[PDB]
Amino acid sequence: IPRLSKVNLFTLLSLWMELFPAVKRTGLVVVKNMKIVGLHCSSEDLHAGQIALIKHGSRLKNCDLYFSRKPCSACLKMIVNAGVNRISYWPADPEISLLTSEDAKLDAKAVERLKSNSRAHVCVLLQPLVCYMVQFVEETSYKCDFIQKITKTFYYECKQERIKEYEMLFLVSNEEMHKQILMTIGLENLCENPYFSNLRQNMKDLILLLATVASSVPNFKHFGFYRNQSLPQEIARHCMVQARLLAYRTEDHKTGVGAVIWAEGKSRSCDGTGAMYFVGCGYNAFPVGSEYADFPHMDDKQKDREIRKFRYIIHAAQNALTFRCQEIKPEERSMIFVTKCPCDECVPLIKGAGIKQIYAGDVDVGKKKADISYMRFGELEGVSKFTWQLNPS
Amino acid sequence: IPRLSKVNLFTLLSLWMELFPAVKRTGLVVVKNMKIVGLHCSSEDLHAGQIALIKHGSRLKNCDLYFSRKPCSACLKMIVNAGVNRISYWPADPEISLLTSEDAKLDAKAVERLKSNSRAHVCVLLQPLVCYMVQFVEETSYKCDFIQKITKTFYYECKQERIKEYEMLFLVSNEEMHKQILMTIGLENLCENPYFSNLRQNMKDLILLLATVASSVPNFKHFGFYRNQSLPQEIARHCMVQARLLAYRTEDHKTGVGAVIWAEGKSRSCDGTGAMYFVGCGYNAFPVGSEYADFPHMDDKQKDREIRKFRYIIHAAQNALTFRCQEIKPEERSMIFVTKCPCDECVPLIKGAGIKQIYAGDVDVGKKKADISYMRFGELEGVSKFTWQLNPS
Amino acid sequence: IPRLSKVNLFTLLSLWMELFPAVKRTGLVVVKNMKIVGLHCSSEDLHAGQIALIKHGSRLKNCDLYFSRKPCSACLKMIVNAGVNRISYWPADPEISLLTSEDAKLDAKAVERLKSNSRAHVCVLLQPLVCYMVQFVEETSYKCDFIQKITKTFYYECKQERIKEYEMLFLVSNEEMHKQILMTIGLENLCENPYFSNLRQNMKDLILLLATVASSVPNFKHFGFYRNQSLPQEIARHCMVQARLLAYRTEDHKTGVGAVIWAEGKSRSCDGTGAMYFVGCGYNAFPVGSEYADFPHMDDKQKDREIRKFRYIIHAAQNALTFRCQEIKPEERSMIFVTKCPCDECVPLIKGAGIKQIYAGDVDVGKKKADISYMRFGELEGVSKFTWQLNPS
Amino acid sequence: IPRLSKVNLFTLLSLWMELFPAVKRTGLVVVKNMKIVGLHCSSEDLHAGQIALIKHGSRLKNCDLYFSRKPCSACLKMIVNAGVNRISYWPADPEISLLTSEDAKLDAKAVERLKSNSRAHVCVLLQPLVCYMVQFVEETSYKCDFIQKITKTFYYECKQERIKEYEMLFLVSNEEMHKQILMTIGLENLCENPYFSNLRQNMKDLILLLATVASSVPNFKHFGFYRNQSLPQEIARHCMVQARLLAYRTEDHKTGVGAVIWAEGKSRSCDGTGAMYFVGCGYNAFPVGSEYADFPHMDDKQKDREIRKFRYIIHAAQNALTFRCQEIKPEERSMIFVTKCPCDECVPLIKGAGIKQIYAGDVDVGKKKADISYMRFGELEGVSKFTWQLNPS
């Protein structure tokens, strides 16, 4: 199966963070050592870069920041003062909108001057997708737990609606307007063909992938996470789409599983996510530092249990708990969103970590295979469980 | 244009080093910080790993070693004692041949035990190529300086002959024999489909690309490097194929240029390359640490000279001289093999470095473009020049 | 006594290297870990940056390069590819002269783009001197070995001549021309007062200091280094001025001593210095990592020999031998230039290091103090000795 | 079997280097990353510390220096300036003898002041030996190749003579004189019992071990290394005793083998060893980073050849070649001294490395075991071989 690249995952996650349920709004991904240490959105008061500065401080040193829009000079100067390594941005309308003009152009010139005289690398890191990536993402999104749960109890129409909305929000349809934007933000190298068309095609492909994944967990009828108070359905859907996006980083050859841990703080913060802050993220993969042939990839079809992948694969929840950027606070409400039902070795870890709520698909609940089982999730106590289903009331 | 990956380049270079013009012969590539610091071949006395130990010593610390065959236990224990990081090997018949049996199997078990109890990672790092990579390599090999030079004064017949020879040398045609080899060398994870077939297909694709590149500089009629004593035509062809392989790592979007610097020592050496030892290697690329859109990629067609790639591209010879692993010794004969004619900014650098001989294609000699010229190569003095041509004697 | 800063030392040394006795000529200082690892001059064929690339390779990683003129785009791209940290340059007419124009301006724009899209920091690092630095340098230059030796057997006339010549060579007298140069090389921040006048005044002060030091070892009458073949008097004077510039970095509170070790290669080199290459440099100082009050600074006047600085001061020749960037080759001629007579502690070290020649001051020869003596220099065997004096023939 | 400590190995090697066949003479061991990178002796002109400074320069950074006597202030200041990490010394009469005295005491005070104000750690690092270490060393020294070779064609008499001589040279028999020395060199903490007696007993035990090892290669009758010109018998015996001392660092459970590679330079150097300089050293051990139970330790008695130590043990010559601090110069004469006969996997490595001469014991010549053989040493060509034997002429 095709795999999403790291920089493309971070770009997609920043674009999705810009859409978090609440000068243009900006989403931001803070990555350290190829691990996500922050997910931020602009608020009505502060920009995403200012929020990242407040939240991290000097911990931004040697960090990679993926913005959904080019940050303003006020944000960029503080970000490079904090000592970040890379600032990747989505080459659309920047934070100070250029589609509104003299102040925005002056801000863009100031950003260029800051970039020219800093060790931080301000750039565009989005890469082309493989030709099969979008088709594979669509195939797996139609076969995901939530779409199938809806089907048993439409998806293409929701996908088309999300395509239109996200193309409006994230792309510049007019080619001359986009050329002007790229000239203003110091991307003149991508203003002439084939680089201009290639950049626009890559952006359109990433937007199509994002719309596909977002439609995999759709706002459809009365479908949401139900069955200790649940989150608003919009935030739950957004976090589940984060997990679904992470599921496409899978090292597994058959099934990708993603997990995101968020927490709800007691006091209101400066972030555009409100009291909620990102805690951890993960996908199913082999132990870090493993080659392609280091560990078996065979499924249960293998006639030898020793050469089955199950005893060596790190699960999405296990990876989210391992590489968490925050501590699970016992007083705070904490949520883990996982694309598949948690297994019998993940549920005890989630419970022991103190995670209060599990939002999950329940397609595999109650299944007992030779190597992996799902009996503990159904009988789990002390952790609220929310599954995709019709609103029972 | 498609780009060869680093690990695939190193695997191909080790396989090609096994074919250097003079228990099975082994080629070896020693890489440090993603830069080639050694190119070795087994001799009649010493294996490639023992030769690498003699040549480097403690400098093998944190190095990646790419072997054309799985090294024996005697080689592996010393290599891991020296402190290397990775030992990638080509999963054909190992150094101690398993196609000859009890001693070879015991050696394989000892190698596995060494691998299990060492920090060094022994693995197979060859990865699938792009579906267009082989076709693109064939297209550029037919359009290379040497094939065109022969054409003006056949290539596919040589390609087929090299395909047969290199498939015989580097592949195991019998599937059961290859399965036994992989079981013995501790690669049981790749002994069942689709992993077995995928591994064999990747190996066949790499062998096809290697045969294509080797045929791009063919042993055809009386064509060789001519026009202070020249190297034997076999060694010159081998080094030119090394440069051609490096040319496929190009960061440029149109033309890939490769360069290899070798030197001929005075006293006898332990290597299978004889007195000749690898000095440096390079390809045309942008300055290290540059993103895709950091520097212009436009050719001379651009209406603005400021946005042309020529003032920012590092040439193959410049990269070979920058990241050389050895010092150019004034007393020793030193050779640089470059796929294209050296330009007017590369010839002075080659002359100043003290390189005695330039083996090059002369298709572009005498051309004077706006940004790049070739006038200094024809009028160069103090450096022997050898070009692809019929033997003038 | 006032002390020269490291960055001003390197700037002065690069400007002086531009004047090494043999597009504008460029001098270059390569510094690693605040230690000089290279002294280069442009040749007829190659620029200083290209020469540094040939000489060092990837060893330029994390190095600071001090250029007497702003390097061209061809030099800058290679230097950045090599991985240097800082490129300080003297903000006069750059390497591609702007006083000759479209090609030079295009090269300057390319240099600006390379600087803006690289991790390397291209900058002007010259800083103001203390108000007493020039007066103190003049006072010590009149009271140095090479001026007092002539006086016993004029200095201000030579100083005025050097002032005129070096102001003509290194400064841009016309303010509009200098403003145009600074605008072209991307130094617009220094084109407006008081920054323009401050930059010009700092440059004038540095040029005055350089002229003072250069005239402290003057081309006067038939005075030179005499008493196994001697170097040309011009090169000997240039190296002595190098050592004299180093003497102003002294940690001593009374007397500054400088030492430069150069070596003559057997074969032809690409550098503008010819076969001669820089080996090491040093000044008298306390052991590295010592504070102001770590060690005693009292001279022999102290009534206790324990609290005398002599037991703890590292001499200039000892520092030059300690932090040498090259190995002393027994076959090659090697010279050490020391501003004062080498002591009985340094002469055995110089002899043991294999240094063939000592060019030294003659004032302190034969002095025998309680802590430091000079008896071994006169009776030294196996090392050629050249002192400042009238030509005996 | 008991194992010699690293620090005790270095202390013994410094004491033995003080006895290298040519103010008191001082031996010096320079160690980097627990590997010996230099073996030096004081000459008639330069002290061991000054020689180490000349030979290494800034390469002494973070190095551990083991002195046979406490270095003088002139040596210590330069060694600290070079950036060494640790200076261990033998707490006998220091470099400036205190048994001759006001100048010596002043030098000791200056050394103490240098130690107090430097990051370098000046200390006495000799450790007590286990109670069986000396008895085991005596047992293995009587059963070594050279003593047995003499016996087949006395050892305790030579042992007693060496005990007397080395106790005279390295120990201070008078307790009051040693107390005065320790007070003067700032070791007052070890001047009163039991620390004074414990220090003296540890020193006596180390000198007994040194005398034992030295007597195991005795100046007896006309026995020397014979069978392209051989080294003087004194230097050959000294290097063989170095190898014997290294043999006691063995990770093997049965037999310890040591190897030292030295080279003779073409030109005279500053060292007290003359033109000869240390190249490398090694002992038989498992690959670096292995635990006690990582690899099998069984001899040939084990039935399963897979669990035999022979396929995983790194030999003494292999370790000497791996961690060499110098390159083998083809023009220079190079010698390797091995306590045992080189095996069939060591002789090809020695020959390929370009080592001109092998000085070794010949007890095992011609033995062919299942895992280790000695057939190649007898038929070795192109390498001079010198074995312990009565002088044939």
Ligand SMILES: Cc1cn([C@H]2C[C@H](O)[C@@H](COP(=O)(O)OP(=O)(O)OP(=O)(O)O)O2)c(=O)nc1N
């Ligand atoms: C339950 C769970 C699993 N994983 C991982 C384990 C596998 O690496 C992959 C699924 O792969 P799997 O075990 O073959 O499951 P399938 O659906 O393909 O099985 P099937 O339909 O044949 O019954 O996700 C995870 O990261 N986090 C979880 N909470």
Ligand SMILES: Cc1cn([C@H]2C[C@H](O)[C@@H](COP(=O)(O)OP(=O)(O)OP(=O)(O)O)O2)c(=O)nc1N
């Ligand atoms: C001469 C030379 C060049 N290079 C690089 C520079 C460019 O990055 C690329 C060619 O790129 P180019 O100049 O656009 O292409 P051509 O020349 O084929 O031009 P054409 O005839 O189609 O107009 O190789 C190199 O690494 N080492 C060399 N010695």
Ligand SMILES: Cc1cn([C@H]2C[C@H](O)[C@@H](COP(=O)(O)OP(=O)(O)OP(=O)(O)O)O2)c(=O)nc1N
């Ligand atoms: C000989 C010599 C010395 N030095 C240093 C160490 C001295 O500590 C300092 C001068 O310091 P100094 O000795 O108090 O000064 P003077 O001798 O001028 O004293 P004077 O004759 O007026 O009483 O240079 C040096 O780096 N290289 C040398 N080859």
Ligand SMILES: Cc1cn([C@H]2C[C@H](O)[C@@H](COP(=O)(O)OP(=O)(O)OP(=O)(O)O)O2)c(=O)nc1N
């Ligand atoms: C020949 C040789 C060996 N070694 C090491 C590896 C062996 O593993 C160990 C002795 O271990 P060994 O082989 O069990 O011992 P012996 O031979 O004494 O056996 P014996 O005749 O009593 O049965 O030295 C070495 O470092 N350098 C050498 N050149």
Ligand SMILES: [Zn+2]
């Ligand atoms: Zn902002």
Ligand SMILES: [Zn+2]
């Ligand atoms: Zn799980």
Ligand SMILES: [Zn+2]
């Ligand atoms: Zn081998």
Ligand SMILES: [Zn+2]
């Ligand atoms: Zn070129």
Ligand SMILES: [Zn+2]
């Ligand atoms: Zn230049």
Ligand SMILES: [Zn+2]
């Ligand atoms: Zn001195």
Ligand SMILES: [Zn+2]
């Ligand atoms: Zn000393």
Ligand SMILES: [Zn+2]
């Ligand atoms: Zn051996």
